[PDB]
Amino acid sequence: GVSVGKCRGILNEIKDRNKRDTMVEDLVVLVRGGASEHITTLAYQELPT
Amino acid sequence: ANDLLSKVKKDKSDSFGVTIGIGPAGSPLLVGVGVSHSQDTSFLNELNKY
């Protein structure tokens, strides 16, 4: 009597993830005339008006 | 942002055994042989990078 056996197994797993985000903003103002307190109030870069 | 995940696993087994018994004589005789083997292998490796 002769008995023989063979077994084999393999597992492969690869994972990849990429994330890229970009955002910019720019502002240019050019005001001529009446450089008093009110135009400094209007010189507020965040609010548009 | 960058993300990398790698995991590998390998499992292998082996089992074999030969049982041979033969006895020839004028008088009654008996020959018995028993052989059995077993192999088990497990491997695991995981990598994660962020």
GROMACS .gro file of C-alpha atoms in nm:
model
   99
    1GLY     CA    1   0.000   0.000   0.000
    2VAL     CA    2   0.123   0.346  -0.101
    3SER     CA    3  -0.046   0.677  -0.014
    4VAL     CA    4   0.074   1.024  -0.116
    5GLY     CA    5  -0.084   1.368  -0.118
    6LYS     CA    6  -0.003   1.721  -0.228
    7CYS     CA    7  -0.155   2.059  -0.145
    8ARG     CA    8  -0.077   2.413  -0.260
    9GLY     CA    9  -0.230   2.754  -0.203
   10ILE     CA   10  -0.147   3.117  -0.278
   11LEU     CA   11  -0.311   3.452  -0.207
   12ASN     CA   12  -0.221   3.797  -0.340
   13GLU     CA   13  -0.375   4.132  -0.248
   14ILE     CA   14  -0.269   4.483  -0.354
   15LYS     CA   15  -0.448   4.810  -0.274
   16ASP     CA   16  -0.369   5.163  -0.391
   17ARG     CA   17  -0.545   5.493  -0.323
   18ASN     CA   18  -0.457   5.847  -0.431
   19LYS     CA   19  -0.623   6.179  -0.348
   20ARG     CA   20  -0.511   6.526  -0.455
   21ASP     CA   21  -0.697   6.855  -0.408
   22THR     CA   22  -0.597   7.213  -0.483
   23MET     CA   23  -0.769   7.551  -0.468
   24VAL     CA   24  -0.638   7.909  -0.469
   25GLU     CA   25  -0.789   8.256  -0.497
   26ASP     CA   26  -0.641   8.595  -0.583
   27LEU     CA   27  -0.756   8.956  -0.553
   28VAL     CA   28  -0.637   9.280  -0.713
   29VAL     CA   29  -0.776   9.625  -0.627
   30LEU     CA   30  -0.682   9.962  -0.780
   31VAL     CA   31  -0.862  10.267  -0.639
   32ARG     CA   32  -0.772  10.630  -0.715
   33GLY     CA   33  -0.941  10.923  -0.544
   34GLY     CA   34  -1.057  11.010  -0.193
   35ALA     CA   35  -0.812  10.815   0.025
   36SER     CA   36  -1.022  10.886   0.335
   37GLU     CA   37  -1.179  10.656   0.594
   38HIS     CA   38  -1.464  10.544   0.367
   39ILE     CA   39  -1.233  10.410   0.095
   40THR     CA   40  -1.039  10.227   0.366
   41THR     CA   41  -1.373  10.073   0.466
   42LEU     CA   42  -1.421   9.976   0.101
   43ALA     CA   43  -1.061   9.845   0.089
   44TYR     CA   44  -1.185   9.536   0.275
   45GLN     CA   45  -1.047   9.249   0.068
   46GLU     CA   46  -1.292   8.985   0.196
   47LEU     CA   47  -1.625   9.158   0.135
   48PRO     CA   48  -1.678   9.259  -0.231
   49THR     CA   49  -1.885   9.574  -0.163
   50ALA     CA   50  -0.254   6.258  -0.002
   51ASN     CA   51  -0.112   5.913  -0.076
   52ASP     CA   52  -0.227   5.570   0.041
   53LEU     CA   53  -0.074   5.226  -0.011
   54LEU     CA   54  -0.194   4.893   0.130
   55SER     CA   55  -0.032   4.558   0.051
   56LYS     CA   56  -0.109   4.221   0.210
   57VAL     CA   57   0.022   3.881   0.101
   58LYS     CA   58  -0.070   3.536   0.233
   59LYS     CA   59   0.054   3.189   0.135
   60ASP     CA   60  -0.065   2.854   0.271
   61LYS     CA   61   0.081   2.517   0.173
   62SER     CA   62   0.024   2.166   0.306
   63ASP     CA   63   0.164   1.818   0.244
   64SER     CA   64   0.070   1.473   0.373
   65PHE     CA   65   0.199   1.135   0.257
   66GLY     CA   66   0.248   0.793   0.414
   67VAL     CA   67   0.341   0.449   0.278
   68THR     CA   68   0.222   0.133   0.456
   69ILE     CA   69   0.365  -0.191   0.313
   70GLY     CA   70   0.377  -0.523   0.494
   71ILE     CA   71   0.469  -0.855   0.332
   72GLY     CA   72   0.578  -1.173   0.507
   73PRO     CA   73   0.619  -1.504   0.318
   74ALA     CA   74   0.698  -1.825   0.516
   75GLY     CA   75   0.578  -2.189   0.541
   76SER     CA   76   0.437  -2.121   0.892
   77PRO     CA   77   0.172  -1.843   0.944
   78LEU     CA   78   0.342  -1.497   0.966
   79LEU     CA   79   0.233  -1.131   0.980
   80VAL     CA   80   0.416  -0.810   0.884
   81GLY     CA   81   0.265  -0.467   0.946
   82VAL     CA   82   0.414  -0.123   0.884
   83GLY     CA   83   0.248   0.213   0.945
   84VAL     CA   84   0.376   0.549   0.819
   85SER     CA   85   0.190   0.881   0.813
   86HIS     CA   86   0.308   1.239   0.770
   87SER     CA   87   0.149   1.583   0.772
   88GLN     CA   88   0.281   1.928   0.683
   89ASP     CA   89   0.116   2.266   0.742
   90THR     CA   90   0.252   2.609   0.648
   91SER     CA   91   0.089   2.949   0.696
   92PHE     CA   92   0.241   3.287   0.608
   93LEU     CA   93   0.085   3.632   0.638
   94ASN     CA   94   0.230   3.978   0.577
   95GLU     CA   95   0.043   4.309   0.567
   96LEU     CA   96   0.167   4.661   0.491
   97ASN     CA   97  -0.017   4.993   0.512
   98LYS     CA   98   0.121   5.339   0.437
   99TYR     CA   99  -0.061   5.673   0.436
   0.00000   0.00000   0.00000
